[PDB]
Coordinates of N, CA and C and ligand atoms in Angstrom, one line a residue:
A1 N 89.1 101.2 101.1 CA 89.2 100.4 100.3 C 89.5 99.2 100.8
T2 N 89.2 97.8 100.2 CA 89.5 96.8 100.8 C 90.7 96.4 99.8
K3 N 91.9 95.7 100.3 CA 92.8 95.6 99.1 C 93.6 94.1 99.5
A4 N 94.0 93.7 98.6 CA 94.8 92.1 98.5 C 95.7 91.9 97.5
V5 N 96.7 90.8 97.9 CA 97.8 90.9 96.9 C 97.9 89.1 96.9
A6 N 98.3 88.8 95.7 CA 98.8 87.2 95.2 C 100.0 87.6 95.2
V7 N 100.7 86.6 95.3 CA 102.4 86.5 94.9 C 102.4 85.2 94.3
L8 N 102.4 85.2 92.9 CA 102.6 83.7 92.0 C 103.7 83.3 92.1
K9 N 104.1 82.1 92.4 CA 105.3 81.6 92.6 C 104.9 80.2 91.5
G10 N 105.9 79.5 91.1 CA 105.7 78.3 89.9 C 106.9 77.3 90.5
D11 N 107.0 76.3 89.7 CA 108.0 75.2 89.6 C 108.9 75.9 88.8
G12 N 108.8 76.6 87.5 CA 109.7 77.1 87.0 C 109.9 78.3 86.9
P13 N 110.1 79.1 85.7 CA 110.3 80.9 85.8 C 109.3 81.9 86.0
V14 N 107.9 80.8 86.1 CA 106.8 81.9 86.3 C 106.6 82.6 87.7
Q15 N 106.7 83.8 87.9 CA 106.5 84.5 89.1 C 105.9 86.0 88.5
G16 N 105.4 86.6 89.7 CA 104.5 87.7 89.8 C 104.0 88.3 91.1
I17 N 103.5 89.3 91.2 CA 102.6 90.0 92.0 C 101.5 90.7 91.3
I18 N 100.3 90.4 92.3 CA 99.4 90.8 91.8 C 98.3 91.6 92.8
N19 N 98.1 92.6 92.4 CA 97.3 93.8 93.5 C 95.7 93.5 93.1
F20 N 94.8 93.8 94.5 CA 93.3 93.6 94.1 C 92.8 95.1 94.8
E21 N 92.3 95.8 94.5 CA 91.6 96.7 95.3 C 90.0 96.9 94.7
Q22 N 89.3 97.4 95.9 CA 87.9 97.4 95.7 C 87.4 98.7 96.6
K23 N 86.9 99.6 95.7 CA 86.6 101.0 96.5 C 85.2 100.5 97.3
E24 N 84.4 100.1 96.7 CA 82.8 99.7 97.1 C 82.7 98.4 97.3
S25 N 81.8 98.0 98.4 CA 82.1 96.6 98.6 C 80.8 95.6 97.5
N26 N 80.4 96.8 96.6 CA 79.7 95.8 95.5 C 80.1 96.5 93.8
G27 N 81.0 97.6 94.2 CA 82.0 98.1 92.8 C 82.9 97.1 92.3
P28 N 83.4 97.3 91.1 CA 84.1 96.6 90.3 C 85.6 96.2 91.4
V29 N 86.4 95.2 91.2 CA 87.5 95.2 91.6 C 88.8 95.2 90.7
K30 N 89.2 96.6 90.9 CA 90.8 96.6 90.2 C 91.8 95.4 90.2
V31 N 92.5 95.2 89.5 CA 93.4 93.9 89.4 C 94.6 94.5 88.5
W32 N 96.1 94.3 89.0 CA 96.9 94.8 88.4 C 98.5 94.1 89.0
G33 N 99.2 94.0 87.8 CA 100.5 93.6 88.4 C 101.4 93.3 86.8
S34 N 102.5 92.4 87.1 CA 102.9 91.8 86.2 C 103.5 90.3 86.5
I35 N 103.6 89.4 85.4 CA 103.9 88.1 85.7 C 105.2 87.8 84.5
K36 N 106.0 87.1 85.0 CA 107.3 87.2 83.9 C 107.4 85.3 83.8
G37 N 108.3 85.1 82.9 CA 108.9 83.9 82.7 C 107.9 83.2 81.8
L38 N 107.0 83.8 81.3 CA 106.0 83.3 80.5 C 106.2 82.9 79.1
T39 N 105.6 82.1 78.2 CA 105.6 82.0 76.8 C 104.9 82.9 76.1
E40 N 105.1 83.4 75.1 CA 104.4 84.6 74.3 C 103.1 84.0 74.2
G41 N 102.1 85.3 74.4 CA 100.4 84.5 74.2 C 99.8 84.7 75.1
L42 N 98.5 84.1 75.1 CA 97.5 84.4 76.1 C 97.6 83.1 76.7
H43 N 97.5 83.7 78.3 CA 97.4 82.5 79.1 C 96.5 82.4 80.4
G44 N 95.5 81.3 80.9 CA 94.5 81.4 81.4 C 94.6 81.9 82.9
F45 N 93.8 82.7 83.3 CA 94.0 83.7 84.6 C 92.6 83.3 85.5
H46 N 92.8 82.3 86.3 CA 91.9 82.0 87.0 C 92.0 82.4 88.5
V47 N 90.9 82.1 89.0 CA 90.5 82.0 90.8 C 90.2 80.5 90.9
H48 N 91.0 79.9 91.6 CA 90.4 78.6 92.0 C 89.6 78.6 93.3
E49 N 89.3 77.3 94.1 CA 88.8 77.2 95.2 C 90.0 77.0 96.5
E50 N 90.6 75.5 96.2 CA 91.5 75.0 97.0 C 91.4 75.5 98.2
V81 N 86.4 77.1 89.6 CA 87.1 77.9 89.1 C 86.3 79.5 88.8
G82 N 87.1 80.4 88.7 CA 86.6 82.1 88.3 C 87.6 82.4 87.5
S83 N 86.8 82.7 86.5 CA 87.7 83.3 85.4 C 87.9 84.8 85.1
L84 N 89.1 85.2 85.4 CA 89.4 86.8 85.0 C 90.1 86.8 83.3
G85 N 89.4 86.2 82.4 CA 90.2 86.0 81.2 C 91.5 85.4 80.9
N86 N 92.3 86.1 80.3 CA 93.5 85.6 80.1 C 94.4 86.8 80.3
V87 N 95.4 86.6 80.5 CA 96.7 87.6 80.6 C 97.2 87.3 79.1
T88 N 98.2 88.3 78.8 CA 99.0 88.4 77.8 C 100.6 88.6 77.9
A89 N 101.3 87.6 77.4 CA 102.7 87.6 77.6 C 103.3 88.3 76.4
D90 N 104.5 89.0 76.7 CA 105.1 89.7 75.5 C 106.4 88.8 74.9
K91 N 106.8 89.3 73.8 CA 108.1 88.1 73.4 C 109.1 88.1 74.4
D92 N 109.6 88.7 75.6 CA 110.6 87.9 76.4 C 109.9 87.7 77.8
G93 N 108.5 87.2 77.9 CA 108.0 86.7 78.9 C 107.1 87.5 79.9
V94 N 106.9 89.0 79.5 CA 106.3 89.3 80.8 C 104.8 90.1 80.2
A95 N 103.9 89.6 81.2 CA 102.7 90.1 81.0 C 101.8 91.1 81.9
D96 N 102.0 92.3 81.6 CA 101.3 93.3 82.1 C 99.7 93.1 82.6
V97 N 99.4 93.0 83.6 CA 98.1 92.8 83.9 C 97.0 94.3 84.6
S98 N 96.1 94.7 84.0 CA 95.3 95.8 84.5 C 93.9 95.2 83.8
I99 N 93.1 95.0 84.9 CA 91.9 94.5 84.6 C 90.7 95.1 85.6
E100 N 89.7 95.6 85.2 CA 88.6 95.8 85.9 C 87.6 94.6 85.9
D101 N 86.9 94.3 87.0 CA 86.1 92.9 87.2 C 84.6 93.4 88.0
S102 N 83.7 93.5 87.5 CA 82.8 93.6 88.4 C 81.9 92.2 89.2
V103 N 82.3 91.1 88.7 CA 81.9 89.9 89.1 C 82.4 89.4 90.3
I104 N 84.2 89.4 90.4 CA 84.8 89.2 91.6 C 84.5 90.2 92.8
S105 N 84.7 89.5 93.9 CA 84.5 90.6 94.7 C 85.4 90.3 96.0
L106 N 86.0 91.3 97.0 CA 86.8 90.7 98.0 C 86.1 90.5 99.4
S107 N 84.8 91.1 99.4 CA 83.7 90.8 100.7 C 82.5 89.9 100.1
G108 N 81.6 89.6 100.9 CA 80.4 88.8 100.9 C 80.7 87.4 100.6
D109 N 79.3 86.7 100.3 CA 79.6 85.2 100.3 C 80.3 84.7 99.4
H110 N 80.8 85.1 98.4 CA 81.5 84.7 97.4 C 83.1 85.8 97.2
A111 N 83.2 85.8 98.4 CA 84.7 86.6 98.4 C 85.9 86.1 98.0
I112 N 86.7 86.4 97.1 CA 88.0 85.8 96.6 C 89.2 86.0 97.5
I113 N 89.1 86.3 98.6 CA 90.2 86.5 99.7 C 90.3 85.1 100.5
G114 N 91.2 84.3 100.4 CA 91.4 83.0 100.7 C 91.6 82.2 99.6
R115 N 91.3 82.5 98.1 CA 91.3 81.7 97.4 C 92.8 82.0 96.5
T116 N 92.7 80.9 95.6 CA 94.2 80.5 94.9 C 94.3 81.5 93.6
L117 N 95.0 82.4 93.1 CA 95.1 83.1 91.8 C 96.0 81.9 91.1
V118 N 95.7 81.8 90.0 CA 96.4 81.0 88.9 C 96.3 81.3 87.5
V119 N 98.1 81.3 87.1 CA 98.0 81.5 85.7 C 98.4 80.2 85.0
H120 N 97.7 80.1 83.8 CA 97.9 78.2 83.4 C 98.6 78.5 82.2
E121 N 99.0 77.2 81.9 CA 100.0 77.0 80.7 C 99.5 77.5 79.1
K122 N 98.2 77.3 79.0 CA 97.5 77.8 77.7 C 96.5 78.9 78.0
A123 N 95.8 79.6 76.9 CA 94.8 80.6 76.9 C 93.6 79.7 77.7
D124 N 92.7 80.2 78.3 CA 91.5 80.3 78.2 C 90.7 80.5 77.2
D125 N 89.9 79.7 76.3 CA 89.7 80.3 75.1 C 88.2 80.7 75.5
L126 N 87.5 80.7 76.4 CA 86.4 81.2 76.9 C 85.3 80.8 76.5
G127 N 85.3 79.3 76.0 CA 83.9 78.7 75.6 C 84.1 79.0 73.7
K128 N 85.2 79.9 73.0 CA 85.2 80.2 72.1 C 86.6 79.4 71.0
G129 N 86.8 78.3 71.6 CA 88.0 77.6 70.9 C 87.9 77.4 69.5
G130 N 86.6 77.2 69.0 CA 86.5 76.8 67.6 C 85.9 75.3 67.9
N131 N 86.0 74.8 68.3 CA 85.6 73.5 69.0 C 85.2 73.1 70.2
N139 N 91.5 71.4 80.3 CA 90.8 72.8 79.6 C 91.6 74.0 79.2
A140 N 92.7 74.7 80.2 CA 93.4 75.6 79.9 C 95.1 75.2 80.1
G141 N 95.4 73.8 80.3 CA 96.4 73.3 80.5 C 97.0 73.7 81.9
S142 N 98.1 72.9 82.2 CA 99.1 73.1 83.3 C 98.5 74.5 84.1
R143 N 98.8 74.2 85.3 CA 98.8 75.5 86.3 C 100.3 75.9 86.6
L144 N 100.9 76.8 85.9 CA 102.3 77.2 85.8 C 102.8 78.0 87.0
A145 N 101.7 78.8 87.5 CA 102.2 79.6 88.6 C 100.7 80.0 89.8
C146 N 100.9 79.8 90.8 CA 99.5 80.3 91.7 C 100.3 81.0 93.0
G147 N 98.8 81.6 93.7 CA 99.3 82.3 94.7 C 97.9 82.7 95.7
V148 N 97.9 82.5 96.8 CA 96.9 82.7 97.5 C 96.5 84.3 97.7
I149 N 95.3 84.4 97.5 CA 94.6 85.9 97.6 C 94.6 86.5 99.1
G150 N 95.2 87.1 99.6 CA 95.3 87.5 100.8 C 95.1 89.0 101.2
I151 N 94.5 89.6 102.3 CA 94.4 90.7 102.4 C 95.4 91.3 102.8
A152 N 95.8 92.7 102.2 CA 97.0 93.7 102.2 C 96.2 94.8 103.3
Ligands
LIG1 ZN1 90.9 101.2 102.8
LIG2 ZN1 92.1 77.3 86.2
LIG3 ZN1 108.9 92.6 77.6
LIG4 ZN1 76.2 82.2 97.5
LIG5 ZN1 87.0 75.5 74.3

């Protein structure tokens, strides 16, 4: 299995660890972790280039967002591998093109490195 981690650090209190595992080179990439020091509600969860959308993560009342995701779009290998890209949790929600009418500041960010 191929594995990676992102350690999200921000300017303010936002921080957290994100794991990625992919059993087959074309199968889904499992994504998990928690992120702390967020405002309650949805927060844009992207993979930049330095965008790819992993949707949003959801923070609870005291700022903690547990992330458990399975994504068959992202991959850790191949021409569009996310290793060496930067994982980003944003200030506002990604409305995913359904805002009723982009995702605010980057609050905390982390490079997706092989583990
Ligand atoms: Zn392995
Ligand atoms: Zn973004
Ligand atoms: Zn909590
Ligand atoms: Zn290509
Ligand atoms: Zn929108």
